[PDB]
Amino acid sequence: MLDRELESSAPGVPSVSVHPLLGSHVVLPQEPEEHLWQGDVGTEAHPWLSDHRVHQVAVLPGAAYCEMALAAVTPVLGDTGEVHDLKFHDMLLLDDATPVWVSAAVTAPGTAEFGVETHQSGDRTQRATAVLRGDVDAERPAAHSIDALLAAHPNRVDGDELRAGFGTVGIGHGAAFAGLSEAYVATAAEPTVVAAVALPGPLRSGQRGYTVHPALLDACFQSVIAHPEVQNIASGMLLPLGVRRLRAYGSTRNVRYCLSRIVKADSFGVEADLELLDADGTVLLSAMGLQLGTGNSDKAEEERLLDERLLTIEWQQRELPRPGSWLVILAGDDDENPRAAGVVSALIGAGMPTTTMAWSHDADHDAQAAALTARLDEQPLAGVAVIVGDSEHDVGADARRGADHVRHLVRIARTLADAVGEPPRLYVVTHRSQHVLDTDEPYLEHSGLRGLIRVVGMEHPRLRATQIDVDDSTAHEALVRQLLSGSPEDETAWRDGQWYAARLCPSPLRAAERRTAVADNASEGMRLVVRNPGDLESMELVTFERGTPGPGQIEVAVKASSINFADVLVAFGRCPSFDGRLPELGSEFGGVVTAVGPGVTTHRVGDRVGGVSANGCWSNFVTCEADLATKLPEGISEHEAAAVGLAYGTVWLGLTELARMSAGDKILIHSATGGVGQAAIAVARAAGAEIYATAGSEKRRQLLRDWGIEHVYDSRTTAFADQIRTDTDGYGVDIVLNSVTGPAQRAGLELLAFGGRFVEIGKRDIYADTRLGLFPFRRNLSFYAVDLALMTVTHPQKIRDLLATVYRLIADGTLPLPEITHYPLEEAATAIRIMGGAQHTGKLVIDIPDTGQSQVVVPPEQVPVFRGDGAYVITGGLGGLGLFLAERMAAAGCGRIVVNSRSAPSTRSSEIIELIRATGADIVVECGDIAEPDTALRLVAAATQTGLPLRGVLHAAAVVEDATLANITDELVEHDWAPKVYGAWNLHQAVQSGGPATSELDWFCAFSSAAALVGSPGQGAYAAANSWLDAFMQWRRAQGLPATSIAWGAWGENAIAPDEGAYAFEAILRHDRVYNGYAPVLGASWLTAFAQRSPFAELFLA
Amino acid sequence: VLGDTGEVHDLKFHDMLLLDDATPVWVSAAVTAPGTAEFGVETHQSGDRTQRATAVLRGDVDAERPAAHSIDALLA
Ligand SMILES: NC(=O)c1ccc[n+]([C@@H]2O[C@H](COP(=O)([O-])OP(=O)(O)OC[C@H]3O[C@@H](n4cnc5c(N)ncnc54)[C@H](OP(=O)(O)O)[C@@H]3O)[C@@H](O)[C@H]2O)c1
């Protein structure tokens, strides 16, 4: 509109052009040339950013920081430049609004430090850092022949096919990030990829002021994965971690191709060099040294894999929802079932024509099978309820009976499957078959049937194989309610009047699923720590092995320790440290020497001492250096010294030592109601200084006024400054014990006059690199930084003397001790909530229990598991997993490993045992059929023989005979059942039967199968044997004995690897969880098929 | 700063800013206490920072709109 422009040539709105990401730019008024941008990278501001998402959560791609760095070059360094050593730190998770701060600072001419950070509730989080360089030479790589390149790379890779592959590992690329059309490759020998990238149509409008659009640059990074050497080697989650050198030669608007080159292709990561070419082949941008990789740590990769692979069955309290003839059939005729009687009466009571069948063991099964098939063809029925009979506490009997039930349910299930018409719904009613409520002790016999009904439902889904695990107390009126409601639930249970329903889920927790113990407080190590800072509920009492001290160290028996404000920040994760590592809870202590390490003349055992250590002083025993402890004088207790130490030390150092607090001079004590505050008052009163104090609460301020201190102000504002200037007739103060921050720090410096002694104890502003204006220093001011924590490492003698001098002054009575409020170790979190909320006054002391009392404690991975002072037994050790585990255990440090297998050792097995015995650890081989009882005893006696107590068992012994329900013979059931169930019981008995050597074991593990859990068709007999063995472990745990079961997946020698399972096995044992299911889950065919068929795997579909 | 109606308190000017074709100035307001903020204008040239103006800002003050006058009566 030529008119609109001429009339608008007068009222113009004041606006300025900005970068889409970087946003508003400000150059700070300081040397060196320091720049600063503030901008939004939220999904509301930049919709297209929602299309890049890791694990279904929108995150900022690596490519975004690349653009930000490239963009920040020209304004800082007014020239053509590069971006060197660009690194991506934490993963930025995007919201509707995600403000981000970029900042570049000139270090040297033609060089500048770059950095993208994000600020949340005061806490800064660095997201990326690099170096900008302008001095670099204009070395534009020569244009390429797009025709020749594409001719040299004939093998085409589709973009959608590759982006689908990214979705499996967890990385999602939406419409915006689908720029990669297709990538052309050749072989692994050829290290290059010619990719056909292009910024999608919607984003072409939004090319705006981008050096390179991050959507486009990420599509180039995707192109690197199309290389065959990358696909073959690094078959894991590859995320960009950084870029060695980034330069833009021109506009990337017309980029149509991306030429990649593999520098290095390793299992850990992939390095590559990129070049963005236009249609002609001219280079527009180059990325040398693009580093991709498995996000963080090698050990953190294992921990993450283990979590995804684990599986557990969980029971949910459910209600029967919404809105034909029936047949009730039995499994024991000589046993009169009131459940069967009551069910038939309740179905007829509901108004359904019910018939009853009496199939029992030791009966003509071919004739009864024909009688059943006749009843089905005679009348069309809706469902068939199979009532399993319960005989009449002996497990031995229930293990033998459990086989007969499986053999009999196969006979019944086979005849229902072989139906001319539409098969009716099968309902199997078992008596306390499996564990649902934590209080339950499982009734076996029916334990094996849950694996069979799961396989029958998979082999023959027409008849929806449903299981109903009933208890004695429940009522038949509520049971038939389930049969007639027709809910699609396949695994169900009844405990009292409540209906439960199973559901498969991964649960790799480490809270209740971690070992527990009880430990003495006089003996045995126990320490207090936060498993994850921020949450005070995560404050745990952990165990530690208190070892011999030395050289030049001392073990102290702590009677008490303090709670400093520093220990609160540690609890919330807000504590700053020069080391970088977050310190341990408890800095100071007061105790009695336990042991003196070789060799120190200074300390003696039984000396009452107080000191410092780190390493957690909220524990019964602390090992501290001789440099950090001092004998307490007679005038003070362990608890008095534990409170005083740091508060008075910091003050002593700060006021009387650094600031040389003279008499009469005015002192400003910030937050004077606290520990350091009360200590400051004490020495200020002693020195004869005029006190000016501050405090947050009115109640807290009024306390200072009552303590006899005139001149009290608010610590949360900058009022105190002008108020003190008025209350001193413009003089101000002399000394300032600054615990406060920000403008209150600056205001405090501006306050003190001539004498000027600013003592900063507060670390926040130092670690934040706050540019402190030097102009107030024109009056001979003196700034003092104080970090006793650091001093304890750099000059421990000065800290020794500083503690020793305050313990002397306080014991002499030269200084009076402050308000001390004791807290038992248990209520430590409560003291933190109080201190952390500014509710407290004075000092808070943690009292350590000097008693013969016991306290419940948690061993994380201090668990023994594999040890040289203990023997081990492995059934099925001469082959399969057992031989790999035995070899791994011998290497892990095990004294005597008895290996068993009914067959003699093979030629390759004997060779493996020879090299293990050659490399120290002895391996005994005692053959036998574990199904026979004498074998279990012979094994146990052999493992103990070398003066070693049995510390663990492994039940890998197994037979696998697979057959379809139609051809599952009665003999084949006993073949698979015998080693798994009879061996497990004979092992259990051999352990109890054994003397005190066997009554000391740490674990009892049993290798189960994932086929029992899901229902792999054809297994059946093997599946049922495992479901009994899985329930047997929950029963063994219920009795108190240790017990474990690991339902394994598919091993190698997509499928579990050998060394992958070794870590999982060892890990599962470090934790107190009975059922563990290690199996490759990802997005497998058998899981996607199982999730859509039944609501048991509801959480897997999502 | 204070997303509301506000007063500017104790506005002081110090050194006389002489202007050139370019004279960059940095304004800077920080919250100190609630509904209150230290305001400050300054200029950095050759390494010497020069505070050209300062004040406090208040958003907690009450809108006591002075009464309107009679333009014509006033002129009489
Ligand atoms: N080596 C060292 O550098 C060193 C040694 C010791 C202590 N210090 C520093 O000195 C300070 C006091 O130590 P202390 O334990 O002896 O005294 P303290 O009074 O026990 O420490 C806590 C006080 O900090 C104030 N505070 C401000 N913001 C707070 C928040 N978000 N949460 C909780 N409290 C808050 C509260 O006082 P008001 O409400 O009265 O303002 C509270 O009483 C700490 O800030 C600590 O880092 C430094």
Curated annotation (Swiss-Prot), chain A:
Residues of the region (Enoylreductase (ER)) are 524-848
Its lineage reads: Bacteria, Bacillati, Actinomycetota, Actinomycetes, Mycobacteriales
List the EC numbers from the record.
2.3.1.-
Residues the record lists as binding NADP(+) = L878, G879, G880, L881, S901, R902, S903, A904, D929, I930, F1007, S1008
Region annotation C-terminal hotdog fold: where it falls in the sequence: 154-301
In Swiss-Prot or TrEMBL terms, this protein is called Mycocerosic acid synthase-like polyketide synthase
Any domain commentary?
Answer: Is organized in a condensing KS-AT and a modifying DH-PsiKR-ER-KR region, followed by a flexibly tethered ACP domain.
Q: What's an example Gene Ontology biological process for this entry?
A: fatty acid biosynthetic process
Give yes or no: UniProt keyword rRNA processing: no
- Keywords for this protein: Acyltransferase, Cell membrane, Fatty acid metabolism, Lipid metabolism, Lipoprotein, Membrane, Multifunctional enzyme, NADP, Oxidoreductase, Palmitate, Phosphopantetheine, Phosphoprotein, Signal, Transferase
**Which stretch of the full sequence is covered here?**
884 to 2008 of 2111
Looking at the record, the residues that make up the PKS/mFAS DH domain are 19-301
Which branch of life, at top level?
Bacteria
Write down the top EC class of this protein: transferase
Which residues constitute the catalytic centre?
Answer: H52, D218
Which intervals of the chain are annotated as region Pseudo beta-ketoacyl reductase (PsiKR)? 325-496
